Design a protein around this ligand. Sequence first.
Ligand SMILES: Nc1nc2c(ncn2[C@@H]2O[C@H](COP(=O)(O)OP(=O)(O)OP(=O)(O)O)[C@@H](O)[C@H]2O)c(=O)[nH]1
Ligand SMILES: Nc1nc2c(ncn2[C@@H]2O[C@H](COP(=O)(O)OP(=O)(O)OP(=O)(O)O)[C@@H](O)[C@H]2O)c(=O)[nH]1
Ligand SMILES: Nc1nc2c(ncn2[C@@H]2O[C@H](COP(=O)(O)OP(=O)(O)O)[C@@H](O)[C@H]2O)c(=O)[nH]1
Ligand SMILES: Nc1nc2c(ncn2[C@@H]2O[C@H](COP(=O)(O)OP(=O)(O)O)[C@@H](O)[C@H]2O)c(=O)[nH]1
Ligand SMILES: [Mg+2]
Ligand SMILES: [Mg+2]
Lengths: 54, 29, 427, 427, 426, 426, 59
Amino acid sequence: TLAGTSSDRDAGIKSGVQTVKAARQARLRELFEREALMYEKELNARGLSLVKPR
Amino acid sequence: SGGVGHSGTVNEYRSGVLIGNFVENAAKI
Amino acid sequence: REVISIHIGQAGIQVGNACWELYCLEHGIQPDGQMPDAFNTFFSETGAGKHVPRCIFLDLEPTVVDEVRTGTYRQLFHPEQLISGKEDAANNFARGHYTIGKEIVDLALDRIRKLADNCTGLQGFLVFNAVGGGTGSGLGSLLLERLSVDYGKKSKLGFTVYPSPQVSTAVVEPYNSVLSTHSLLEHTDVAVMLDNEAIYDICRRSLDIERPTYTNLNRLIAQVISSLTASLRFDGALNVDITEFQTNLVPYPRIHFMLSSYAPIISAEKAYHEQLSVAEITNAAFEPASMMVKCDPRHGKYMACCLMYRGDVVPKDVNASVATIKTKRTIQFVDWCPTGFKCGINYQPPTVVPGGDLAKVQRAVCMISNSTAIGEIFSRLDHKFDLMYAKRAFVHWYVGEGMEEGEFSEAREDLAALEKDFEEVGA
Amino acid sequence: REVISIHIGQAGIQVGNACWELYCLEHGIQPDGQMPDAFNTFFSETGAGKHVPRCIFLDLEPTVVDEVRTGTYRQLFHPEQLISGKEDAANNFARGHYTIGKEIVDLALDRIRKLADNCTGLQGFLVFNAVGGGTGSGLGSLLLERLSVDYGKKSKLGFTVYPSPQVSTAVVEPYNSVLSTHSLLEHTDVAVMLDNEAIYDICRRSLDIERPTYTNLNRLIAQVISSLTASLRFDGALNVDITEFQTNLVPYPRIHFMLSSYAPIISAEKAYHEQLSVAEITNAAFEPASMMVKCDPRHGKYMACCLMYRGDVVPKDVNASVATIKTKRTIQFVDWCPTGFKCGINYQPPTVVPGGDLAKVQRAVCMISNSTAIGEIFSRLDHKFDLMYAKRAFVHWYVGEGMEEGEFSEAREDLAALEKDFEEVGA
Amino acid sequence: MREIVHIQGGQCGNQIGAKFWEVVSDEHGIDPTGTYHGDSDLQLERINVYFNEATGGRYVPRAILMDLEPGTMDSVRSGPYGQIFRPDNFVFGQTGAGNNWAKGHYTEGAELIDSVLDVVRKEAESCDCLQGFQVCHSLGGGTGSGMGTLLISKIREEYPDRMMLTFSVVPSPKVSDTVVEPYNATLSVHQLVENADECMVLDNEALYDICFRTLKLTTPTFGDLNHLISAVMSGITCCLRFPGQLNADLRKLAVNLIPFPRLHFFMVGFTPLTSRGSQQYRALTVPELTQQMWDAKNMMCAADPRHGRYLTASALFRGRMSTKEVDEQMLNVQNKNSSYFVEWIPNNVKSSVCDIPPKGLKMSATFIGNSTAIQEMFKRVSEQFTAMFRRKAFLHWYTGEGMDEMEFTEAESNMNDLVSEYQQYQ
Amino acid sequence: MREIVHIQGGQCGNQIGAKFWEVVSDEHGIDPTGTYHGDSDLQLERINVYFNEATGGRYVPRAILMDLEPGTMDSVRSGPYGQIFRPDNFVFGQTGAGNNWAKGHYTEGAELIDSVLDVVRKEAESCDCLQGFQVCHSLGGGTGSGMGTLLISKIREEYPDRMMLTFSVVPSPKVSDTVVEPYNATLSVHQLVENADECMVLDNEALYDICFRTLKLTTPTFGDLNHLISAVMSGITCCLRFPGQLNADLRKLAVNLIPFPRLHFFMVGFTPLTSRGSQQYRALTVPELTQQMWDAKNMMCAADPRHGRYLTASALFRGRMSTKEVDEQMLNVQNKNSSYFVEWIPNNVKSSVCDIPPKGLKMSATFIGNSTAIQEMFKRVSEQFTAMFRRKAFLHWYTGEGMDEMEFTEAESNMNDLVSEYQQYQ
Amino acid sequence: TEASWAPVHNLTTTNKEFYEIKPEAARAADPDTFRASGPSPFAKTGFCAKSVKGEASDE
Ligand SMILES: Nc1nc2c(ncn2[C@@H]2O[C@H](COP(=O)(O)OP(=O)(O)OP(=O)(O)O)[C@@H](O)[C@H]2O)c(=O)[nH]1
Ligand SMILES: Nc1nc2c(ncn2[C@@H]2O[C@H](COP(=O)(O)OP(=O)(O)OP(=O)(O)O)[C@@H](O)[C@H]2O)c(=O)[nH]1
Ligand SMILES: Nc1nc2c(ncn2[C@@H]2O[C@H](COP(=O)(O)OP(=O)(O)O)[C@@H](O)[C@H]2O)c(=O)[nH]1
Ligand SMILES: Nc1nc2c(ncn2[C@@H]2O[C@H](COP(=O)(O)OP(=O)(O)O)[C@@H](O)[C@H]2O)c(=O)[nH]1
Ligand SMILES: [Mg+2]
Ligand SMILES: [Mg+2]
């Protein structure tokens, strides 16, 4: 289904569109984590580095 | 055991144990 | 020698459905009807390698009957020996006694007659019914009447399911119970009571099943029945037949009501625990914690007892134990009968049903005793019947079905009479 | 053996939010509620494949509570135990004890009743709150009162968070503290103090976190609580249940205030640094550099101490170490209690939390003592209360709520009585 | 075997029975096409109670839908399980009564009842051993109350031996739909006390309260209320449909619950009822079921039973349980709250167990209580009737139809004596 | 023929008893599954003293577990030789006393002691000729001391003609577990001087020092200490279970060791005890056993026997030994250290010889010396009692439950006069 | 989660359970004790009743 019924909003169950959106966000985050782990090695091959948060 | 009655028994062991009647258990023209 | 059993009501054929499982397991009969002469008292051997019990299940609702017809024992139970009415009696004596009785009892006795004709050495009938319901009470009374007028001289051992004082599943069960007694007196020769709260206490205390159901109750009641038919079935050192309960336990034509008991009631692990000997289980079968009927033999006086023993039993120690129970004083006897015991020994140890909670025991005791605590039971039920009848409650169901106040007043005064007899005899 | 835990206030439910994280991580329970008998003291097993904790979070502002209702542990507590009010008490004892309490305590104790009824072997209660705030102080005291009139005979473990002397984040917390003790004296059984600045110095010195948040504080406090209940949850060589603190630690009906401490509080590289054994952790448990309340036990004399050991601890070396402690003279006991110790040894080591700061040590020690430095702490709070009360500052908020000056004067003299009791016991 | 013939009257009857035949068709696993698609053969042996095989497994229900406007008929056949009712069982008028008991009892009935008696008869001798009739209708409306009531009279005059169960919604003042609800309620009740064997009273205030507290719903449409009432009707008929340890048919329940031929107005409950947000909190135990069952807020009537005394009560149970725990719990609720039960009857509780729970559940129960707090409800209606009749407002639309004022006097007297006798046995 | 019933109370007694039944079962050659698997026919002859055959050679111990928390029970059932016990004889409370002697003797005793008395009755008359009772417990605990003591008083009220052995550990200030140790020990001693016939005083401190010096262990856990006490107790009743050249029954030991009815507190020692490194460098002769027996560092109490005199002492030998070597050794040790023995009793050393050593060992011994050095221990405890009682510390958890100040004053008087009479006979 | 979660049928009457699932499971679990003893050593087979009229003819 695309959306939720009237009982879903009370039961707290998220709608189909909401759940698919969240899952998509998180899969994307995984991909960019892999990409960052690759870029760090590619930079240290040259002697430069990414900046890391504090 | 028993609620409002108390039984009187003695335990029975096998042939080897020395009990109240071990000698008679051993006895068995 | 043969004995046939009939089951009436919703309770009747559930006890039968556990009892006949036990018999097939005891004689090693597969549920499909054949093994892979001790059986001849229960199963008749048809044709070649087939057995068909000497039983009739009967009820007025077809639901529990065709549950049996579609259960495990489809091939075992013969099709005709399960009688099924089209509609219930519905907790109503007169309904089960006057309208539907007239249309089912003739077919029942027609069936049972050719059961008795196929039999040869018939000992008697033994019946299983519930007096709280409609079918067991109403046409149970009707069929017992027509059995008594047809055969009569044969024994009719009755195991009846009475209402507990506090635990109750119905409301009009006082009416149905009372109207059942008025025929339970002069049609049953030897009647054994079987309450429910007592067996609930048993399965909670000793077998320690925290959440029991009816099937558990049925299985150990079936164990009791097997333990008192074992004498006819199996070879014993001192046998005791159906004619003995008639003689050694009924000293008066209107006093036939027995307390039953059983020992050892034991779990699977407590069997490893306890040292099972003869004297302590003979003691265990006397305390009210192991009786099948909720009553107190402390406040009553015993009249006569019978003790079936199964298994490895020598007459020496059982005679020694009853000698100790006679020299005890906490339980007391009436001065009428100084030799208030009968024993009976069968060699076969009881079998174990897969899925039951009772372990394999070497020896077992079934005590069927008479007392006056039953005279206390009927008064306890009498009081709560009068409370309801004082307001003419529920009466219109019976009157509209065809009866009147006559059988109400007459059955109420009958219990009053039986009260007078029990207090007179207990003196 | 089962114990339930209630959490009152902004601080209490965050501490509990670390505790339950620790518990599920120790018993192998996934936060969504299922495992992939030792848990039975905390989690009831509803149905199948689900475990719900025996606790109630309650607060008046909904912001922190629905932060839980949306956090990671949504599936652990479903939303009916988490009680939430509509508006906060706002650091106002009278507002929390009289205005909103009268509408929330009935629902709270009605919920705790059927929690206790679901329980069968209730050991006691343990509450989580900070006395500086408004909700944790006011309606906490009201809740403890109604629980004490409910059961009374059951032990109540109050783990309170007191205001640190110089590092403090409120203004009227002296007022709320004093008003809290006035009931915490005559209601709870065993009250454990846990200040904040001592924990700050601990994570600054040993764990060397230089920017610690509240998560790290609540994490190691949860470690102390878990180390307290490990004797109930897991089997050890010398178990000590909740009823023992009631007897072993409280020599008087009013002297129940306990300083806690813990060792070895060690990071992931200092663990490889240090050779860990029983003698040094028994030492480290007693230096003020590892106590959870900023006070100097050198100034005081111990009354009674308790030692919870977890992990790879045999009893010979704990006996040898406490022998060395009793023969050392840098610390001093009272002349009343020659047997000043109570050991306790459990087999399971403390677990780690992924992303936490503590390493997996083989053994650990939770020390819980009783001394007179606490009597010094209460005088420190009483002085800063009397200064602000000298000018009648902030009083009009309490009187505007509906209280008066009488309870202020009587709580003041109550703590004065407590001060006299500690100083006469110290002699 | 034992047969239940369903009768639904008026808009309320049509929609409620629509959801009812939805639940039953679910339980026996028959698709909205009309064919069996379950797995266990336990379901096939007891569909003769509710369905009839026509051709190739086409099981069509034994129900009579009755109304005067085809609008409800189209609302029936718009939803799922609409193409499974026999089109000959769709009797319908053309005018519509609309809140006039007289139109529903003298004019419109005069030409509708003869056709439905044809239908009811044909579908009654179609089965062999009829158990009885089961009716769900309304009391505020006209075409349900008046038409159904007169049909109740006619069938009780033809078949006086069969059973008769009726689910009747009664008006509440707070949720007060129509204006002439007392004029219709009193006349209907005055007929129900003589011809209906026993009546399980319903209303809408109790249901709205239940959906506010227990179920915790935002928009409780009529689809939900119909679903709850349907759950009640399935739980009461479960005994005939499924094997169990202690079967209890309708006549077995009537005799255990009706001590006097006029004291046959029950209040009904249902358990379990919790929100989906709290379904994992709760365990499935008999005490958990019982504490909700004997609760005051779980009755489906607007009468607090703790204002009176229970005369009798019954509890039907579905699912594998332990009869010891069942009976022990019934004994506790009878012993602890000892004042709320009458004294001159011992063991006021009937119990029953059937071994199949409703689909999607594990263990359920159903409560049927004959209490004396129903006289509070009838007084609540009769006093409003006197307020109207005292100056005979709205009376002419009845008077000009055939009815006279004596019918309203008799309705007053019969309501007054009935609440007098309930007050007597309190 | 002679019968010993074993009772276990409290955590310390339960774990000691568990190791004791492990050692005994190993000696009589029954595996933990409960069947007989011994080889020599000397084992069957005296298993009726301790076990009961139930059915098919399943030998269960004649023991009774007693406590208030299931934690000790689970630790008992978990280990091997745990399933041999009686599943019914686990008479067992649910609350937990928790070091409160009033809770163990007044609160929970009142509703658990009826049950344990019933089961100890069952096990008493199940056998014919009792010899005595054997209870293992502590003196600092709450559920061990209090409940065990009240059990002892009830037993002496019932069977006054039977012997009684109580293996009780006494607390030391060096090894001090709980804080109310004097508040429990003084009360239990006050009851044991009037109820029990004789007891064996133990403590963990002397055990720790033994594992330090003579055993040289690095990890002396509780199982090891319990193993030492179990070997001691097995050595005590070796004489009833096996024939010897000079048998010593339990009463025989009592009458030889108790010259005054109140002077019945014993110190115990066991030999031989040698490390696995030095066990190759030693001999096994009677002088070797004797030089290890009369060592002060081998007594299992915190009482230096060189700090007092011996009233009497007994030496129980196990193994094929020279009797002339035995009594000449006892005569030599009594003539050398003539000061340390009492003067007004000649031949202060009772001796006995059994013909069966512990399994695998060649020759062993057990030393039971009724010395007067035990007054140091009671003075060591009574001074702590006075110190706390001077200022009423911890007093109210006892007073508020039913106990009065008179009990504590009476306990002080009896402990003090006991030490006075020991000092008198010194 | 809702879509993946599959509801329960729960169609096992108590008689079918207690007489087919439990005893078969017990027999499979404990093959030692639940075995068919076959003929019983003690039986009341009396060939007197068989004898009073028996003895098949050979003709
Ligand atoms: N102990 C035991 N009692 C049973 C059993 N089955 C039914 N009963 C009892 O039977 C009584 C009610 O009668 P039922 O057997 O249920 O029904 P009935 O006797 O056939 O009467 P009707 O319902 O009118 O047909 C109840 O009180 C039950 O306790 C059973 O299997 N075991
Ligand atoms: N240890 C610890 N203390 C906290 C935490 N959060 C708040 N506190 C302390 O709580 C005290 C004030 O009470 P709060 O818990 O913040 O608030 P409250 O008790 O709910 O009272 P209200 O603010 O009126 O709702 C402050 O002195 C803080 O030091 C925390 O997460 N951990
Ligand atoms: N709960 C519920 N009540 C209904 C439904 N349909 C009608 N009603 C009630 O029926 C009453 C009016 O009935 P009405 O339609 O006038 O009956 P009719 O016109 O004679 O068929 C109102 O109070 C409604 O609450 C329904 O589907 N569910
Ligand atoms: N030898 C030995 N002593 C023990 C053991 N467990 C506890 N103790 C002793 O028991 C004393 C405390 O008694 P406690 O266990 O509290 O008794 P209870 O609580 O009444 O059961 C301590 O001084 C310990 O020395 C053990 O496993 N072995
Ligand atoms: Mg029936
Ligand atoms: Mg706050």
